[PDB]
Amino acid sequence: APQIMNVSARQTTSLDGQWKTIVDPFENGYYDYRLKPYDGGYAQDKTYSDKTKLQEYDFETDKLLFVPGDWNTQRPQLYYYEGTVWYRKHFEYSLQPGKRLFLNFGAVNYEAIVWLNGKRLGRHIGGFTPFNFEITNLLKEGTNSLVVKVDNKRLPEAVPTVNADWWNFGGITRPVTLIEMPATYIRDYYVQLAKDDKNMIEGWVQLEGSDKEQKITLDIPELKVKKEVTTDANGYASFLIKSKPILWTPENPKLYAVNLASETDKVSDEIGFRTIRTEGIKILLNDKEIFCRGISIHEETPYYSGRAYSKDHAHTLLSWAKELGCNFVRLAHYPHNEEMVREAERMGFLVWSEIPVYWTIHWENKDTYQNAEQQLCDMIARDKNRCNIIIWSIANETPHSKTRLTFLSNLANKARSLDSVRLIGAAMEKEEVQPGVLTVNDPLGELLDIISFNEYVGWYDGDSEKCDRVNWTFDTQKPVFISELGGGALYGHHGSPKERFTEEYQEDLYIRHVNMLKRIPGLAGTTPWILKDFRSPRRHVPEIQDDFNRKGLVSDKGQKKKAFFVLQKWYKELTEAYK
Amino acid sequence: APQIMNVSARQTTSLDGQWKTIVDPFENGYYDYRLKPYDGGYAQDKTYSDKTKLQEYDFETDKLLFVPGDWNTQRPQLYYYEGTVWYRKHFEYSLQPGKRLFLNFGAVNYEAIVWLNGKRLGRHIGGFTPFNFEITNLLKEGTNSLVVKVDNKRLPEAVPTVNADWWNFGGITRPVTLIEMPATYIRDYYVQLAKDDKNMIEGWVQLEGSDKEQKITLDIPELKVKKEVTTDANGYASFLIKSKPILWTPENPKLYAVNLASETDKVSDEIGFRTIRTEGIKILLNDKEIFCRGISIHEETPYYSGRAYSKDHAHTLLSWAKELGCNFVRLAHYPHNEEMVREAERMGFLVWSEIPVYWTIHWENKDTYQNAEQQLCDMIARDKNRCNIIIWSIANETPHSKTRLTFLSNLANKARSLDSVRLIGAAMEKEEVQPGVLTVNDPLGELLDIISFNEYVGWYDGDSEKCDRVNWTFDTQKPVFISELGGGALYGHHGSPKERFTEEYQEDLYIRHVNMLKRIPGLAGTTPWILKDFRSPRRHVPEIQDDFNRKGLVSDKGQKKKAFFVLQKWYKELTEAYK
Amino acid sequence: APQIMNVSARQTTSLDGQWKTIVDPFENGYYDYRLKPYDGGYAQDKTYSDKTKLQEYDFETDKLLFVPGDWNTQRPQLYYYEGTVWYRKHFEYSLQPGKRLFLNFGAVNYEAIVWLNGKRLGRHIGGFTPFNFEITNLLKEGTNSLVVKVDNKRLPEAVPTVNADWWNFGGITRPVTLIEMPATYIRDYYVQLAKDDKNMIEGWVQLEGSDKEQKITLDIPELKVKKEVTTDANGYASFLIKSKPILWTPENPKLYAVNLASETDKVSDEIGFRTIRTEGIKILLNDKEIFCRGISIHEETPYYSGRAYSKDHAHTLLSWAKELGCNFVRLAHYPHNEEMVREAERMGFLVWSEIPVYWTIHWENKDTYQNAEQQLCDMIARDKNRCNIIIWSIANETPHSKTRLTFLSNLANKARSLDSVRLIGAAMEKEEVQPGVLTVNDPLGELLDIISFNEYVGWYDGDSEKCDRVNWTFDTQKPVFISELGGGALYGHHGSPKERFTEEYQEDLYIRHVNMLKRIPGLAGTTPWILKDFRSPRRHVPEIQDDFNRKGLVSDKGQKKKAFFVLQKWYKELTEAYK
Ligand SMILES: [Cl-]
Ligand SMILES: [Cl-]
Ligand SMILES: [Cl-]
């Protein structure tokens, strides 16, 4: 089924909790010993109560896993696990005749195949985007059986591919929700300021069901807006509304109550309004020049470092970014859960939103492209009304090649065709064209609204001293945005500022690096890497990394490292300077 | 380097113990973020003592694993682990100038890449066959660094492929041995009775080194044999020796001390002599009709169910087969460690020896074929002097197809070209051509000396009662050998004989099944599945299987199930009847 | 209630396998929140079927543990666990009226409380001695429930007390066995040579039940012995038999089939005959002077280092002792399972058998004395017919005090009153009375038949050099027996002979220490510490001990360290010298 907008404001019933599970690395529940699909696999969820017959599994007496969640932090045996885990849930639901029922997954990494009562609903790939199935006519009276086959095996042709710098978190990682709808319902809608127009609200609305021609009212009571339209034979209607809304900023993240009521459905939202554009090397929010005082963040929890999903997780992480002095967060390297985006929206954080087109994607594979573009479409479709998002990012650290350029230009064009307002970015990389002279020479830059790139001078490229003896130049007059920078340190590990992975080295790096940043012309944003130490299978120094990337300014246990205050101090200066 | 015969009788120094290790699922130690090999990966074994520079690993402070051993039973985190683990060992060795030094791996599952002092020695695939490297000219004074990159990822094109019914045990699973040799050494030799000739010992010997033309003496003092030959320019010599040795049988497993002394090397062995052939439906050992009272055995330890490797493990397992009344063991589904074969040899067990050409091998892949044929050659080369081995098996439960038939016929022909004496087998499968009429209709049978097949009447095919109402017929007059049969049971789990996985069901099955076996014409051997419960990721019934195949007649904890005594009783009758 | 001789030869039914369990550190299933024993706790084994009522447990859906075994190696969470684990087993048994049924526990560490069908059978303390309950009248039709509350908390007043050098293995550590008896049955018997008499078999038989007065026949067919006696009203009869048995020896461990038959019961056994005495500083076996070429052994398995209990475990351990050249094993520091003693009996190992009166026992506590004495009686009663046992040991490394001497004197007197044949020992400790002069100055020695003591010159007491410079003297003329000596090494850890925990240090230590043993006047025995590395929570050197005592001559993975061959060589010389 197509995406449902604003799931949280619908008639929802959670299916979360603890589910029955079967770890199945050889996919015995799907394939027989000839490696063929067979009838009687684990999707049938047959309780093994008659022991005069033979079967090889029993959900009813197997172990549990929490849903939502990565499986990796739930059992020692699952820490590295890559492969199939079956999940099973029994539920009852009383669906009044004529109402519709949808099963919504916030995210499953990586491939999900879903059955209800032994009937296959469908299949999804892409670990960070939501998907749903209509189950209106498949629900039975009494106990219903939902089985989900989850597989997180790394595949060469997948998005992302077989190599990345974060943990391969498998499982049903975001909430599972039943959504009851009327027979014809408001499925999707868009309400935002028109491009560069502080005074014009535009949008549209899309109905789904057999009664597609209806009157619809868009209601913004605080703005005394009440616009009525009628949908066409395809259930669609658009609108233009002149209005002077108070404009959302990080300092005053104003949101308006927005109500949509058609004849057969109604839904409420919280939507803010703002204009965003570039002008030369300036980033203009509501026509005012801003600096993006940012920090990068992975979708991983404080303290126990599982996959984040809740408002609790988001608020804690963003409260650290608040203390750091940020007005901006880079959510890397994939769409985060919706609670993170919404909490950024209400607390006052501009957002960079990204799909995992990351490192050595298979640029020549047409299935790979369709998967990436599908993830692009789903990312924008979910969050198109989140006014704090100002940058869509289509790639991170991808090698230069002709097929790669073609691949990403198609993505950039698709992004613009879907959203004319927000800026298009991508984490490019730097080059030292001559000793001491750093720049970004990437043909991808021509398709981007900003010169966005990662650089690690003083960590990967030289010792801290090298920050002091380089300068930057750019051959185009677009805002410069450094989307990653920094260095590693273990909290509580102290020593000389020359000794790597001590807090003192990271502090000294941040001092010299900030001084370098202050010499860069056109610099309009920084999202250093990273807010919190996070899990990566590429970080193997014992007692220092222990499978964590240690470039947090905050430890995984919520402790602010020395370098945190260096960046906080610079962000205080930028706050005053951009007043 | 080519195989070394009889490693245990050489000047050996063990490298076993506990080694430094790095779990590396994304192969960060081999590939950089562009997925390219890079200089400075983990093979350099650089101790991270200078922290003014950056690296991402440190063997010196990482965790240990035992060598030899699967990694799966050593850490909860490694239970399911499929991927790369790096192993590192530091050692010293004082090699007198002019002597040679070889590094011998008994087995590594699945792919091994080996470095010494940062220099790549080579690479091996195939998890159950030995391999060695000459390190004579790479050894340094003082500390030497040996790094082994072990990967057990399942590959479609591998042997075995992505599906099998036993645990994917990764690691350095058999001993690691340094072998010192003289500058020209006896590398390989063969000493066995000529085909069907109780009175003629034949063989050959192969030298390696710059002094290949030498006098060689074959010494069997108890037989008063002293035959002298000279090798040719390629270091090879053959021999024929008339003699009347006492012939090895299971009842009197007579072995002779055999000494080989060339001018530059000498090695001793323990070798027995016997003739084996078929005659119609009879299997003839030393011209006497025998029945193979067998049991199948995986290479997995009693009690803790790790990969077996020691004489302790072998003796315990074979002591159970002894108590069961066996004169024969089927070592499934791959070459076992040499201690198992030798202990079978000295205790009096005929042996079926197999390579893992198992289920859905990629018959059309020429690399797949070469791997299978290499494993075939290595299996025979290692154990060609073990007179208790009488069957080489080239496949198990492979689907019928033309490319499969071609693949296996090439294997069968290669086997015969290497060894004219032993019988060629393969686990075929049965078919019910008409209700109640069971047979084996497989074109592979024409290439085999026996009608060897697996059947599970009363477990997979019907309830126990079905054993009572079927009969078998075969359209050729070759000995019938049932290489698998039986059913599952949890030790200490009791109930009605109708209830599957109880001891009583397995007992009732074995009674009815044995009665069926007694009606089969031409039956000359049975190796029921299996001696000991063993680990399989296809066995998911909670509290009953718990990732174990439960078809043992002995539990994984050494407890004899009721059905053990049913088969023991039949084997007692067959012992008397074949006197 | 009383001990049953020779359980394995009775009509037995195993209850072993996998049992339901509840870990209960606060003993919630036994005490209420007023810390009062309550009724309706876990021993009722009430399946939680009716969820309209409240309870806080459910065996029926809880986790399994293997029975027999320690719990510590079965789950990571139970590695260090000290406290209560509840065990539950369901079974059926059909008992013809008139017959009796007993429940036999081979051992439970440390305290066991036992219920059948919700009714308390009794309680046991002492982790290494067997105990029985009669359940004849409490057996119900259908499902019977057996619940065992097992606690291994260390207690100051217990035997052993709150400190020892081995792992606190909790659980049902040896088999659980149902024993069917006739109404009047042969409970106990003794059949051994009279003291110092090669020709007189003496003994006695003890019946229990309502018809204790019966005719008894003792048959030893190979000796053509057939003796009839009639028991008295207490069920007792003694006998004296002239015979000329082949005397049991390590080199020829001759055992006889012994058959006892009453009017209503019969049992068979395998029993050997030997004499043993001291003569000044000599130990005489069958009048012949012997040296006890020993090795100490804990009751811990090869490879996985759990609690040993099976014939497999015993055979593997003793096969290392055989290869070492031993004729003697010290089973420390408590009664081992019967399989170990029987396998030593049949393979030809003299045995030292011990109770865990170890270190700082509470000598003034009368309950502590009764417990120690009960363990002494139980040890001797179970194994009084094992001719390979020649030393009972009453203590190990206990501090000198008046009350300690009284305590041990009472045990020595009790031992002698139960067994007038075997030697009484205890591991005393050495004293450096003058610099360079070592002796044993412990008044306990007057109560022992041998001067048995532990000494660690070259490990705890000096470096290896000290072995070269010290002299020993002894004031009495009793055989000197060194019951512990040696040092630690990790297999595969190599370095200078002066680097402790290398194989080379341990090898150098044994070379120098063996030389010292040659100049100890009166030395008649050595059982160095120890055969196999074993678990101890007092051994904390990371990557070297890792919670293992490393004084094995064999690693816990079955690998012979360099020092193994030093002791083996000396034992080969002792074998020739004592021919
Ligand atoms: Cl880092
Ligand atoms: Cl099974
Ligand atoms: Cl130690």
* Residue A55 to chain B, least CA–CA distance (Å): 8
HSE (CB half, 13 Å, CA atoms) of A375?
30
Closest-approach residue (CA) in chain A for B398: A34
Q: Measure CA A484 to chain center.
A: 17
Smallest CA-to-CA distance from C333 within C541, C83, C529 is with C529
Nearest neighbour of B77 by CB, restricted to A77, A463, A542 = A77
Structure token pair of residue A247: 């404009």
Burial C118-144 (b: 16+ CB within 10 A, else e): eeebeebbbbbbbbbbbbeebbeeeeb
> Residues in chain A, how many?
579
> In the beta sheet, which residues pair with residue A169?
none
Nearest to B343 by CA among B313, B367, B380: B313
The two counts, helices (H) then strands (E), for chain A are 6, 33
Q: Which amino acid is at A154?
A: R
Which phi and psi angles does C185 have, rounded to 5°?
Answer: -135, 160
CA distance A41 to A26: 13
Which among A22, A463, A541 has CB closest to B56? A541
Strands (E) located in C152-250: 176-181, 185-193, 200-208, 215-220, 225-230, 236-242
Q: Is B190 annotated as a binding residue?
A: no
The answer to whether residues A54 and B111 touch, using CB atoms and an 8 Å cutoff, is no
CB contact under 8 A, B83 and A79: no
| Mutation to test the B interface, candidates A32, A33, A155, most B Cβ within 10 Å | A33
Does A396 belong to an annotated binding site?
Answer: yes
**What 8-state DSSP symbol labels residue A3?**
-
Please say whether the beta carbons of A450 and A425 come within 8 A: yes
Distances in Å between the alpha carbon of B218 and those of B186, B207, B240, C361? 12, 14, 11, 66
Handedness of CA B540, B543, B546, B548 (dihedral sign): negative
- Residue A344 C-alpha to ligand 1 middle, in angstroms? 26
Give the whole-angstrom CA distance, residue C428 versus residue C445.
Answer: 8
Mutate to test the interface with B, among C75, C144, C178, C312 (most CBs of B within 10 A): C312
Residues B539, B397, B457: CA angle, nearest 5 degrees: 70
d(C-alpha A7, C-alpha A4), whole Å: 6
Task: Evaluate whether A214 touches A230 at the Cβ level (below 8 Å).
Answer: yes
Return the amino acid letter for A421.
Answer: V
Whether the Cβ atoms of residue A86 and residue A148 lie closer than 8 Å to each other: yes
Q: Which of C286, C291, C237 has the alpha carbon at shortest distance from C261?
A: C237
Please state the φ and ψ torsions of residue B50, each to the nearest 5 degrees: -100, 100
Q: Which of A296, A311, A227, A242 is nearest to A273 (CA)?
A: A242
Q: Is C263 exposed, middle or buried (CB count within 10 Å of its CB: 0-12, 13-18, 19+)? A: middle
Q: Which chains have 3+ CB pairs within 8 A of B?
A: A, C
Strand A11-14 and strand B523-526: the pairing is unpaired
- Experimental technique of record: X-ray
Helix B311-323, helix B338-347: angle, nearest 10: 40
Strand pairing report for C389-396 and C350-354: parallel
Tokens 């219903």 found at: A144
Among chain A residues, the shortest Cα distance to B49 is held by: A499
Comparing CA positions, the residue from A439, A571, A458 lying closest to residue A510 is: A458
Give the dihedral of Cα atoms B446, B452, B456, B462; nearest 10 deg. Answer: 40
| Neighbour count for residue B365 (Cβ, 10 Å) | 18
- Centre of ligand 1 to C-alpha A49, Å, is 52
Identify the helix (H) or strand (E) that includes residue C293: strand C292-297
B49 lies within 8 A of chain A by CB = no
CA distance A449 to A276: 11
**By the 8 A CB rule, do C484 and C428 touch?**
no
Peptide bond into C443 cis (omega under 30): no
Q: Please tell me the distance from the alpha carbon of residue B259 to that of residue C431, in angstroms, as a whole number.
A: 54
**Residue (of A189, A182, A204, A190) closest to A102 by Cα position:** A182
Is C190 in the B-facing interface, judged by CB distances under 8 Å? no
How far away is chain B from the Cα of A108, in angstroms, using its nearest Cα? 21
**Would residue A126 be called left, alpha or beta, if left means φ above 0 and alpha means ψ between -120 and 50 degrees?**
left
How many helices (H) and strands (E) would you count in chain C? Answer: 7, 33
Calculate how close chain C gets to B487, using CA atoms only, in Å: 18
CA of B73 to the centre of ligand 2 (A): 21
| Chains near A (3 or more Cβ pairs under 8 Å) | B
Here the tokens at position C487 are: 């040092």
Distance from CA of C312 to the nearest CA of B (A): 6
C chain contacts of residue B14, beta-carbon cutoff 8 Å: 492, 559
- Count of residues in chain C: 579
A 10 A CB-CB count for B48 gives: 19
Q: Is A141 annotated as a binding residue?
A: no
CA nearest to A327, candidates A182, A461, A525, A153: A525
- B499 and A31: CB-CB below 8 Å? no
C238 near C190, Cβ under 8 Å?
no
Token pair 């059309």: residue: B364
Beta strands (DSSP E) in A64-167 are: 64-67, 84-91, 100-105, 111-116, 119-125, 131-134, 144-151
Neighbour subunits, C (≥3 Cβ pairs < 8 A): B
Contact A80 B33 (CB under 8 A): no
CB C375 within 8 A of CB C159: yes
**Interfacial A residues in 99-128 facing B (CB < 8 Å):** none
CA B234 to each of CA A545, B30, B211, B231, B237: distance values in angstroms, whole numbers, following the listed order:
55, 40, 10, 7, 9
Q: B–C: how many Cβ contacts below 8 A?
A: 67
**CA dihedral in degrees (A278, A281, A285, A291; nearest 10)?**
150
Q: What residues contact A168, with CB distance under 8 A and at least 6 apart?
A: A72, A82, A109, A152, A154, A537, B25
Chain B residues in contact with A165 by the CB 8 A cut-off are 33
Is residue A578 a contact partner of residue A522, using CB atoms and an 8 Å limit?
no
Are B115 and B30 spatial neighbours (Cβ–Cβ below 8 Å)? no
User: Mapped to the 3 state alphabet, what secondary structure does B160-217 carry?
Assistant: CCCCCCCCCCCECCCCEEEEEECCCEEEEEEEEECCCCCCEEEEEEEEECCCCCCEEE
Alpha carbon distance, N-terminus to C-terminus of chain B? 47
**Chain A residues with CB-CB distance to B61 below 8 A:** 542-543
Using a CB-CB cut-off of 8 Å, the residues of chain B touching C18 are 490, 492, 543
- Least CB–CB distance from B537: residue in A26, A33, A165: A26
Q: Do A35 and B360 touch (CB under 8 A)?
A: yes
Which of A61, A77, A82 faces B25 most closely, judged by CB atoms?
A82
Determine whether the annotation assigns residue A358 to a binding site.
Answer: yes
Please give the residue of chain B at the shortest CA–CA distance from C66: B557
Alpha-carbon span C577 to A149, nearest angstrom: 72
CA distance A73 to C92: 42
Kind and range of the H or E run holding C346: helix C338-347
- SS3 category, C225: strand
Interface test with A, best of B56, B149, B457 (most A CBs within 10 A): B56
CA–centroid distance, A300 to ligand 1, in Å, is 16
List of residues 6+ apart from C285 with CB closer than 8 A: C249, C274, C275, C276, C350, C390
Contact B28 A360 (CB under 8 A): no
* Nearest-neighbour CA in chain A from B475: distance (Å): 27
Q: Rounded to whole angstroms, how far apart are CA atoms B184 and B98? A: 10
Contact residues, chain B, for C303 at CB < 8 Å? 301, 303-304, 306, 312
Residue C192 phi/psi, 5-degree rounding, is: -150, 165
Between chains, do B359 and A35 touch, taking CB under 8 Å as contact? yes
Q: B537: which chain A residues are within 8 Å (Cβ-Cβ)?
A: 24-26, 28
Query: From CA B438, how far away is CA B454, in angstroms rounded?
Result: 12
Coil, strand or helix at A465: helix
Residues 6+ apart with CB under 8 A from A472: A438, A439, A480, A519, A520, A521
Helix axes C338-347, C366-383, angle to 10 degrees: 40
Contacts of A78 in chain B (CB under 8 A): 80
Residue type, C284: L
Half-sphere exposure of B491 (CA within 13 A, CB side): 24
* Integer Cα distance of A545 and A488 in angstroms: 9
CA distance A150 to chain B (A): 16
Residues from chain B contacting residue A81 (CB–CB below 8 Å): 80
- Does residue A421 contact residue A197 with C-beta atoms inside 8 Å? no
In eight-state DSSP terms, residue A359 is S
Burial (CB < 10 A; 0-12, 13-18, 19+), residue A411, is: buried
CA atoms within 13 A on the CB side of C488: 17
Does B358 count as an annotated binding residue? yes
Q: Are strands C423-429 and C389-396 parallel, antiparallel or unpaired?
A: parallel
Contact B16 C492 (CB under 8 A): yes
* Token reading at B80: 């399911």
- Does B301 contact C303 at a Cβ distance shorter than 8 Å? yes
Q: What are residue B554's DSSP bridge partners?
A: B532, B560
Order of strands, sheet of A215-220, starting from the edge strand that comes earlier in the sequence: A225-230, A215-220, A256-262, A266-271
CA-wise closest residue to B313 among B328, B327, B303: B303
CB C503 within 8 A of CB C476: no
Alpha helices in B357-454 (DSSP H): 366-383, 402-418
Q: Which two tokens stand for residue C202?
A: 């003496």
* Residue C248 CA: distances (Å) to CA of C269, C276, C323, C389: 15, 11, 20, 11
CA distance B339 to chain C (A): 14
Q: Give the single-character DSSP code of B156.
A: T
Confirm or reject contact between C175 and chain B (CB < 8 A). Answer: no
A501 interfaces chain B, CB cutoff of 8 Å = yes
Give the amino acid at A399.
Answer: P
